[PDB]
């Protein structure tokens, strides 16, 4: 039956097979759960230092590239720049910290981002009770959780040369999940996506982001770049 022209909907290609993502759910180590509750539900005056904490994690992951080269020169062949990108999305109310560091395996997410007790956790909670500044968090080993000063939910997408791409996610409440991520490949590195709380939207503003980077993170050691969406 002759055709001279087809509608879009007719030549619509059949979907790729549905992907299966394996998901697992884990409880946070008891004292990590306690700290996340404390961080979430207490007022702190200097919440901006969350960005100094995640930038530091990124910087540490990038320093690992340079040293891992000494025992695996393969990585010198990568053409990827060692850098950090800050991506506020006013539309979705997210701030995303992206790096091209070494990334995390599945077991690294499960162990490093919640299941293994940290020996400073108790001491830091005591310090906060006794009125320490929240800024001291990173010296107690638990600075990743400062994300929950500003974020109601945090998703971490990551890819390590030794594993497949995974997503960790938690809205606190005592648990997190790790799942395989068959979504947009990142190549190598980690993206931390902060879903900001309703009253913490100043961290999507480019001036505010520039201010806190200048104040707290001016020895990162790698280029940091802020992507600003053009105002329509």
Ligand X SMILES: Nc1ncnc2c1ncn2[C@@H]1O[C@@H]2COP(=O)(O)O[C@H]2[C@H]1O
Q: Which residues bind ligand X (CB under 6 A)?
A: 57-58, 61, 99, 101, 104, 112-113, 141, 144, 190
Q: Which long-range contacts (CB under 8 A, 24 or more apart) does 151-155 make?
A: 151/50, 151/194, 151/195, 151/196, 151/197, 151/200, 152/195, 152/196, 152/197, 153/195, 154/192, 154/193, 154/194, 154/195, 155/192, 155/193, 155/195
**Judged by CB, which is closer to ligand X: 138, or 201?**
138
DSSP 12: P
In the complex, the smallest distance separating the C-beta of residue 64 from ligand X, rounded to whole angstroms, is 8
CA atoms of 169 and 178, how far apart (whole Å): 7
**Judged by CB, which is closer to ligand X: 88, or 114?**
114
In the complex, the smallest distance separating the C-beta of residue 167 from ligand X, rounded to whole angstroms, is 14
**Judged by CB, which is closer to ligand X: 138, or 202?**
138
**Judged by CB, which is closer to ligand X: 88, or 103?**
103
In the complex, the smallest distance separating the C-beta of residue 137 from ligand X, rounded to whole angstroms, is 11
Secondary structure element (H or E) that encloses residue 52, with its range: helix 50-68
Residue count of the chain, please give it: 232
In the complex, the smallest distance separating the C-beta of residue 156 from ligand X, rounded to whole angstroms, is 7
In the complex, the smallest distance separating the C-beta of residue 68 from ligand X, rounded to whole angstroms, is 12
| Dihedral of alpha carbons 184, 84, 155, 187, sign | positive
In the complex, the smallest distance separating the C-beta of residue 184 from ligand X, rounded to whole angstroms, is 17
In the complex, the smallest distance separating the C-beta of residue 57 from ligand X, rounded to whole angstroms, is 3
| Tokens linked to 199 | 């009253």
**Judged by CB, which is closer to ligand X: 138, or 174?**
138
- Residue pair 170/154 in contact by the 8 Å Cβ criterion: yes
CA atoms of 113 and 169, how far apart (whole Å): 10
**Judged by CB, which is closer to ligand X: 141, or 183?**
141
**Judged by CB, which is closer to ligand X: 104, or 151?**
104
Distances (CA, A) of 64 to 75, 82, 163, 187: 11, 11, 17, 16
Among residues 178, 177, 174, the alpha carbon closest in space to that of 36 is found at 174
């Amino acid at each position: 039956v002759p055709r001279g022209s087809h509608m879009p909907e007719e030549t619509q290609t059949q979907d790729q097979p549905m992907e299966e993502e394996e998901v697992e759910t884990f409880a946070f180590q008891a004292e990590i759960a306690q700290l996340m509750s404390l961080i979430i539900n207490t007022f702190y005056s200097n919440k901006e230092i969350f960005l100094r904490e995640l930038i530091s994690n990124s910087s540490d992951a990038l320093d690992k590239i340079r040293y891992e080269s000494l025992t695996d020169p393969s990585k010198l062949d990568s053409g990827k720049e060692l850098h950090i990108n800050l991506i506020p999305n006013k539309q979705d109310r997210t701030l995303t910290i992206v790096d091209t560091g070494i990334g995390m395996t599945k077991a690294d997410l499960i162990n490093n981002l919640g299941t293994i007790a940290r020996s400073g956790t108790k001491a830091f909670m005591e310090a906060l009770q006794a009125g320490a500044d929240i800024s001291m968090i990173g010296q107690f080993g638990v600075g990743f959780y400062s994300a929950y000063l500003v974020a109601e939910k945090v998703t971490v997408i990551t890819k390590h040369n030794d594993d497949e791409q995974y997503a960790w996610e938690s809205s606190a409440g005592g648990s997190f999940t790790v799942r395989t991520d068959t979504g947009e490949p990142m190549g190598r590195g980690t993206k931390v996506i902060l879903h900001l709380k309703e009253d913490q939207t100043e961290y999507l503003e480019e001036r505010r982001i520039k201010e806190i980077v200048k104040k707290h993170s001016q020895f990162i050691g790698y280029p940091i770049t802020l992507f600003v969406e053009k105002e329509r």
